[PDB]
C-alpha cells in the first residue's frame, strides 16, 4: 500500500509532488543545463576538466621521471647498431634538454634498449602533449581546436640509418622535404618533414662530428581532450609494451628510487594506475556527446492547455534521465581519477614514487610543458596542484551534484509512470 510507504519514506512523497509539477521539472531541466555548462564549458571549476588534465599530466610526469634513465638505441628496423647516436631534442635527459639513444650491439627489445621506432612514437606523443599543456587545454565542449607542434632529432655515427630516406620519406637527405597528411579524429593533420646535413668541419659545429638533422612540423593537430588522451595512452603504452631497461643516477640524501636498475614495465602499480586514469577520463569525456545529444532547454507542460499528465505527457523523460545520468557518471569518474593517484590513499613503493618524484618539479613555478636540464627525475607536470584543484572543483560542485541527483530522480519517476 502507498500511504504506508509515504510515512517511513518521506522524501519520496516530495519526489512525486515534484514530478507532477511542470514548473518543478522545468526548474530541474534548467539546472541541468547549468551543470552541463560547468562540466563541459568551464575549466578551473570543472571537475571533469581537472580530471582529464590530471590523467594527461600523470602520463607526461611518468616519462619526465624515468625517461633520462631509459636505454635506447639501434637502427631503423629495430635492429642492433654497431655505432649509432640518435638524439631527440626537447626531452628530459640527464642534465640536458635532450635524450640520447646511443646503445650499440644490444638488440632492442624487452629489458633492453628501446628501439628508435618506439622512441619516435613516444617522442611524437610527448612533444604534442607538452605543446598542448603549454598552450593550456580547452574546455571539454571544444573539439575543433588545433595546435601546431615542432620537434627535431639528429643522427650521427657510422651506419646510422635512422635519418635516411627510408626512415623519413624525404626525397633527398641534404636539404630535402616531404609533406604527408593523415586523419587523427575525422581531422586532417599535416606533417612537414625536412632534412639537413651538417658536416664535421662545417663552421660553428661544436660537437666534433657530422650529423643529419630532421625537423618535423605538424599542423592542425587535434588538441581536444579525446585527442590528447589518445596521445597519453600512446605514450604510456609504448613504454609499457617496449618495456625497456633503465638505470637511475641516485642523488646523495635525496628521495630514493627503488628499484635502481630494472625494466620500465616493472613499475606495475604506477603504470596500471596511469592506464586506469586514462581509461576513466576517456569514458568521462564520452559522456559529453550524451549530454549534447539530450539538450534540456525546451520547456515542458501539458499539451492542449490541459493539466500535465505524468503518465502520458512525459516522453522527454528518457532524455532527461540520460542527460542527468551522464552528468553524474562524469562526476564520479572525475573523482575516481583523482583517487587512483592521490597519495593520501597510496601505500609503500607506489606512494614514494608519487610523493617523491611524480608530484615534484626540479625546474627553476615555470609554465606547463617546459623541459629544462633539471626536469629529469621529477614529474614537472603540476600533479599536486591538479589534485588540489580537482578537489576544490568538486567541493564547489556540492549544489550541482544534488541538483543532478534530483533531476535524475524526477526523470526516473516519469520513465516509471509511462509503462
Amino acid at each position, epitope marked *: 500500500n502507498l500511504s504506508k510507504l509515504l510515512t517511513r519514506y518521506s*522524501t519520496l512523497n*516530495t*519526489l512525486i509532488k*515534484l514530478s507532477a509539477d511542470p514548473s518543478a521539472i522545468n526548474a530541474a531541466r534548467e539546472n541541468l543545463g547549468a551543470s552541463a555548462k560547468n562540466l563541459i564549458g568551464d575549466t578551473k571549476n570543472s571537475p571533469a576538466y581537472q580530471a582529464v588534465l590530471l590523467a594527461i599530466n600523470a602520463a607526461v610526469g611518468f616519462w619526465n621521471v624515468l625517461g633520462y634513465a631509459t636505454q635506447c638505441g639501434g637502427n631503423a628496423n629495430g635492429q642492433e647498431s654497431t655505432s649509432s647516436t640518435t638524439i631527440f631534442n626537447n626531452e628530459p635527459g640527464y642534465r640536458s634538454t635532450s635524450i640520447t639513444c646511443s646503445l650499440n650491439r644490444y638488440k632492442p627489445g624487452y629489458y633492453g634498449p628501446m628501439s628508435i621506432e618506439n622512441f619516435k612514437k613516444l617522442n611524437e606523443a610527448y612533444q604534442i602533449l607538452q605543446t598542448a599543456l603549454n598552450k593550456g587545454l580547452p574546455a571539454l565542449k571544444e573539439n575543433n581546436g588545433t595546435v601546431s607542434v615542432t620537434y627535431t632529432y639528429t643522427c650521427s655515427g657510422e651506419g646510422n640509418d635512422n635519418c635516411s630516406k627510408k626512415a623519413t620519406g624525404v626525397s633527398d637527405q641534404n636539404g630535402g622535404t616531404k609533406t604527408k597528411t593523415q586523419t587523427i579524429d575525422g581531422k586532417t593533420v599535416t606533417t612537414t618533414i625536412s632534412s639537413k646535413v651538417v658536416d664535421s668541419q662545417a663552421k660553428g659545429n661544436t660537437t666534433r662530428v657530422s650529423y643529419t638533422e630532421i625537423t618535423n612540423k605538424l599542423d592542425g593537430v587535434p588538441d581536444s581532450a579525446q585527442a590528447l588522451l589518445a596521445q597519453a595512452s600512446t605514450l604510456i603504452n609504448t613504454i609499457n609494451t617496449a618495456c625497456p631497461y633503465f638505470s637511475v643516477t641516485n642523488k646523495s640524501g635525496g628521495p630514493q628510487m627503488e628499484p635502481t636498475r630494472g625494466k620500465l614495465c616493472g613499475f606495475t602499480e604506477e603504470i596500471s594506475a596511469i592506464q586506469k586514469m586514462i581509461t576513466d577520463a576517456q569514458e568521462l569525456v564520452n559522456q559529453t556527446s550524451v549530454i549534447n545529444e539530450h539538450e534540456q532547454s525546451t520547456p515542458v507542460g501539458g499539451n492542449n492547455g490541459k493539466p500535465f499528465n505524468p503518465f502520458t505527457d512525459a516522453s522527454f523523460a528518457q532524455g532527461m534521465l540520460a542527460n542527468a545520468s551522464a552528468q*553524474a557518471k562524469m*562526476l*564520479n569518474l572525475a*573523482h575516481q581519477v583523482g*583517487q587512483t593517484i*592521490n597519495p*593520501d*590513499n597510496l601505500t609503500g613503493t607506489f606512494k614514494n614514487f608519487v610523493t617523491g618524484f611524480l608530484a615534484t618539479c626540479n625546474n627553476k613555478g615555470s609554465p606547463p610543458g617546459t623541459v629544462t636540464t633539471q626536469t629529469f627525475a621529477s614529474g614537472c607536470a603540476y600533479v599536486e596542484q591538479t589534485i*588540489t584543484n580537482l*578537489n*576544490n572543483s*568538486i*567541493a*564547489h*560542485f*556540492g*549544489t550541482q*551534484e*544534488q541538483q543532478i*541527483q*534530483q533531476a535524475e530522480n524526477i526523470a526516473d519517476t516519469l520513465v516509471n509512470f509511462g509503462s
Partner: nanobody, 113 residues
Framework: VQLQESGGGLVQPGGSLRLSCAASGSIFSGNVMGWYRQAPGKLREWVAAITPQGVPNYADSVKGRFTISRDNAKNMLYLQMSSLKPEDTALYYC????????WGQGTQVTVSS
C-alpha cells in the same frame, strides 16, 4: 563504508549546535567531505563542504553562521552551527563529495521557540 551523524537536538533561535560525523577511512581519507540537510516537505540540500587540506565552502543560506571543519587524524567531520533560525530545522547528514550512495541515519535539528 559507514557514516554516523550525531549532536542534533531541539534548540532555540539564536542558539548553537555542534554536529559530528564519524566516517570510515574508505569514505573519508583523501576525499572532500560535506554536510547536507533535508527539511520538512523538501528534498535534500547541500550545506557545506571541506577539502582534505581544510578549505571550507558554504551554501549561501548558511554562510557566515556555520563553520565546517575536519579532523584528519580521527576521520571526524564537524559542523558548528550559530545563530540558528527556524528555517534551519532539518535532518542533517554527512557524506563525501561526490556522494557515497548509502546515507547515514542523520541527526535531527529542530530550531523552535
Amino acid at each position: 563504508v559507514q557514516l554516523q551523524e550525531s549532536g542534533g537536538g531541539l534548540v532555540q533561535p539564536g542558539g548553537s549546535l555542534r554536529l559530528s560525523c564519524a566516517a570510515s577511512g574508505s569514505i573519508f581519507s583523501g576525499n572532500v567531505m560535506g554536510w547536507y540537510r533535508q527539511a520538512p516537505g523538501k528534498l535534500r540540500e547541500w550545506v557545506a563542504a571541506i577539502t582534505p587540506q581544510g578549505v571550507p565552502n558554504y551554501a549561501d543560506s548558511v554562510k557566515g553562521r556555520f563553520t565546517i571543519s575536519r579532523d584528519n587524524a580521527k576521520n571526524m567531520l564537524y559542523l558548528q552551527m550559530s545563530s540558528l533560525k527556524p528555517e534551519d530545522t532539518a535532518l542533517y547528514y554527512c557524506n563525501r563529495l561526490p556522494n557515497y550512495r548509502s546515507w547515514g541515519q542523520g541527526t535531527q535539528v529542530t530550531v523552535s521557540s
